[PDB]
Structure formats: C-alpha cells, structure tokens
Amino acid sequence: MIGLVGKKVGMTRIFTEDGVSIPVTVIEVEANRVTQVKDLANDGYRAIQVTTGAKKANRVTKPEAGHFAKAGVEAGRGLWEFRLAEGEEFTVGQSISVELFADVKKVDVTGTSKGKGFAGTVKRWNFRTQDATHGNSLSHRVPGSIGQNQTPGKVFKGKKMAGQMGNERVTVQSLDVVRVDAERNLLLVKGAVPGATGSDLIVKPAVKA
Template identity: 55%
Template sequence: MPGLIGKKVGMTSVFSVEGKSIPCTVIECGPCVVTQVKTTETDGYEALQLGFEEKKEKHTTKPLSGHFKKAGTTPKRKLVEFSGFETEHKLGDVIDVTLFEGTAFVDVIGTSKGKGFQGVVKRHGFSGVGEATHGQDDRQRAPGSIGACSTPSRVFKGMRMAGRTGGDRVTVANLQVLKVIPENNLLLVKGSVPGTKGSFVIIEK
C-alpha cells in the first residue's frame, strides 16, 4: 500500500459542521525522500524505500552513508518500504502529505506504549478472585486457578497470565482523515494513534 512515514505530534480536537467536538491526532507526515527504488528485475518485487527525518552524518554508519549519497540526499533516521504508488518515482524524489489529499480513510501503524511487567488485572482485564471478606485479604488482583490437576497435568499454551505489556506493533485501520495541512506537513486523523508523542508512525492509504 502507498503511504508515508510520520511522527505523532499529539492530540487535539476540531469542530464539525454541526458544532460537535471531534477528538483527533496530529501527525507530522513527511516530507519523505525516495532513498531506493526496488524493481522486479533486480529485487524480485516493486517497492519504494522512503526516508524520513534528518540524522547527523557522524551518527550514520559508512554503508548507510553511501546508500544515502547514492540517492543524493542527507542521512535519514527512519527507512520504510512502500508499494503500490500510482506514479513513478526516482531516487531523491520528495513525497509529502499531499499524497493523502482526497483520501477519506487511512491505516496507521505504530508501537504502543510499553507498560512493563503487569498483572492479569491490568494486562487482560481480570476482575480478581472473590471479595475482600472471608479471609481474602491478598487475592483481589490474583489470577486464580490456571489449570486442572491430573488431567491434563499441565498448563495450556496461551494461558493469559502476568507478563510484559505494551511495546507491540499495532495497526489501527480506517481512521478518518479530517484535514490535510500541506504548508506544515500535518495530517489530522479522527481518533487515537498508538505510541507516545514524538514516536514514528507509518500511514498507509
């Protein structure tokens, strides 16, 4: 799917024609530079590699520095491949947020906030074991029984238990595009987007 790399700026709200307040996420979307053009002849598939956000030369490895010089651009912090662009692009071409003008809905991919090691109540929404009476002084947030005894004499794989939460790749599909602001490279989408403020996101048509 054609798309761009962006950065989550934060959340705000806009007013609809009817006067309703609509919560939305502001994304700094591009401009992205074409750093590699993959073709069926050379790579076995067709795709564009896009780079986003400036990076210092001294923080870039020698192989990547040569990769960016071949494209005629400065080092970039984030590289992502996209396919399905309707128009042809060459090395060094710049694609900006105007790509989404006239687009009603987009998919946004990001990394959710990491929450560390969490119990079953926070991680899976368990209600805990019993009430606070009848000697249940330390069981309010416990997982309870996790399996039978003699049969099957083991705990099944996939049992919902305590563990590391968040920090996963999350895709939110069909977010409505509320506004495109080309002069500031901003894209406003209805609803929330995974990740923290300042984190990279991928926006696809």
C-alpha cells in the same frame, strides 16, 4: 497505494460550524525521500524505501552514509518500505508529500504503543479479581487456576499470564482524514493513534471499507 511516515505531534480538537467538536490527532508528515526502488528482477518484489527527517552527520555510520550517497539523498532518521501496487512507479530521489492524501477519505495508522512494563493478569487480560474480604488469604489479584488435574497434566500454550504489556506495533484501522494541510506538512485524523508524542507513525490508506 503507498503511505507516508509521520510523527505524532499530539491531540487537539476541531470545532465545526454546527457545534460538533472533533477530537483529532496531529501528525507531522515532512517530505519522504525515496532512497531505493525494489523490482521483481533484482529483489523478487516491488517496493520503495523511503527516509525522512534529519540526522547529524557524526551519528550516521559509514555503511549507512554510503547508502544515502548512492541514492543522492540526505540522511534521515530511519528507513521504511512500502509495497507498490500494480501500476505505481517511483524513482530514486523523488520526494513524496502529504498532498498524496488529498483525496483519501480514511487511513490506517500503525505505531508502537506506550510501554506498560511487566503487567499483571488483571491489567493485561481483564481478569476478574477475587474477593477483598470474606476470608481471602493473600490472593486478591492473583490469577487463580491455570489448568485441570492429571488430564492433561500440563498447562496449555497460549495461557494468559502476567508479562510484558505494551511497547509493540499496533495498527488502528479506518480513521477519517479531517484535514490535509500541505503548507505546514500536517495531517489531521479523527481519533487517537498508538504511541507517545514524538513517536514515528506510518499512515496508509485504509484496506477495508
């Protein structure tokens, strides 16, 4: 099934009647407007393109504005696509709301994780540090060795080294849907999802069991 595009509002808790507290993430899913439908004839695959949110008219370009005008839709903050399974059909201009997840029990949420900048090998790869005392010389959080001698005489591809951490697409799988609230456009999932507050989230029904 297709998913929806939301926005991370924050985390909170839900107290249950038997004294359990469920940590939930609040995801604001406003209506997603279908702006283009792709089919096997013209495009080679089946998918829908949706937009959501609002954009100020002075910041939408002419190429983008004419794309929305052909669909008969108001400009949103972006465009996303979802592959259509066999037996699903949509129409341009149709709106899709969070009630689509009314009977869904688990979801998968993908977003962009928080950016940690340039991180070292201890933070990025859980490398053990070396001794703090006992004679150590300027080598307290350095990576250590990176290869063997003359054979192979080089460093291997995929060696674990310091570099840019975070700020990338991450998917978290099999999160329970605690509450769908169509009147306030909310979806509450159990647990934590990637990103900062106010970031875009794509929520889809779980592919595994």
